[PDB]
């Protein structure tokens, strides 16, 4: 079993589904998902999360004490700390992988101007926190990328490179389009070899870095 | 006055959700999004989507005759069509960019094994279309992916280097100080210092942005 806490101030919107992928592995059992309103750690009658920030910018900063209090709460020392953020180290499918067989990820999402840095920095005293980027673009907090962090690490769980070239199914014709022929000719070497091809030829016009090369 | 519909097996999970961005974004008017089970499409009383892949292997694919169908209702000529996939062109802030001022975005959301190849080459003899990835690792479905999208193109609807860290009050807090500079009221000092602690920052954690 794995527990996952995810922290916001969007609760509705990090509700588990039971028709998806997560909404399946916690049916299983395999996965518990628990989702938290930032919110109750506040004090005062605004339940205030963020203030300006110092030095200046544009936005917010989500306030350190209240994120202080949930993840004293709610992280253990044993706890993978993730925190959402387009400054963060790259999450690939090797991480997916390596957190696939964590106990505790605990996943904080905040708005993209940041949370304070002294959460992460406290946090790391105690436990192993990981700042990551699901992609080169900005989302106005962690919710999605949380989403999209559960789904990669869920699919690997026990119990649950190049780019793979076009896939094709019945019928063999379809709107005057035929699926190549190869892969009707039940010849497994020819088509083995057709889709490293087709993979490679996919991989050099789509992702050229992939293969080192520029671009 | 943007449109975006969404194809998906999965409408429940991409359901709107008004406590979120893309619900304010909606209840302000700025956009429409519509989500559509790909299911009201099948052919047959079991509402079959995929089929065994051509050539053998694992997994399934997602059958043309039922995309083809639903895509013929939903685009229209001026449609730019997502596919989201891990084999796609990269999703990039410019690619956000460029959407954001598109009328009318239709996101195929298919499992990662794939939509038979057909139906967006099919599509792109009367449309855009554009297959396209959001990082480098696989999710069961595009689902998710639509999300991020979602996301990143509807926050810059009129409506480098890593950023480096931010604080705000208490200026001491747990024993850790708010960088005294901060604090100086030198903003061309600040700026500076603002600037180094990001060239560490894409040092340490995206050198590939350095060359
Ligand atoms: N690129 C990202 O992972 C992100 C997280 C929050 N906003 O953007
Ligand atoms: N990396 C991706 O965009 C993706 C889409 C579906 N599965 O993975």
């Not at 964590?102 to 105690?126: F, K, P, S, W």
């Not at 980027?133 to 990669?152: K, M, R």
């Not at 793979?164 to 009707?184: A, F, I, K, N, Q």
Request: proline share 7%; hydrophobic share 40%.
């Amino acid at each position: 079993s794995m527990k996952i806490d995810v922290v916001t101030i969007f609760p509705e919107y990090l509700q588990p589904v039971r028709q998806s992928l997560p909404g399946k592995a916690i049916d299983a059992g395999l996965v518990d998902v628990a989702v938290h309103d930032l919110r109750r750690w506040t004090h005062d009658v605004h339940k205030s999360v963020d203030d300006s920030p110092y030095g200046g910018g544009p936005g917010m900063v989500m306030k350190p004490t209240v994120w202080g209090d949930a993840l004293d709460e709610i992280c253990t020392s044993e706890t993978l700390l993730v925190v959402p953020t387009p400054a963060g180290y790259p999450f690939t499918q090797e991480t997916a992988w390596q957190w696939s067989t964590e106990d505790h990820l605990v996943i904080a999402c905040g708005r993209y101007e940041g949370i304070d840095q002294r959460v992460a920095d406290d946090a790391a005293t105690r436990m192993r926190v990981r700042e990551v980027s699901i992609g080169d673009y900005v989302l106005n907090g962690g919710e999605a990328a949380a989403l999209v962090i559960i789904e990669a690490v869920l699919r690997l769980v026990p119990g649950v490179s190049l780019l793979e070239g076009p896939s094709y199914t019945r019928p063999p014709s379809w709107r005057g389009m035929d699926v190549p022929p190869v892969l009707l000719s039940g010849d497994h070497a020819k088509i083995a070899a057709w889709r490293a091809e087709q993979s490679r030829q996919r991989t050099i016009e789509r992702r050229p870095d992939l293969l080192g090369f520029d671009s």
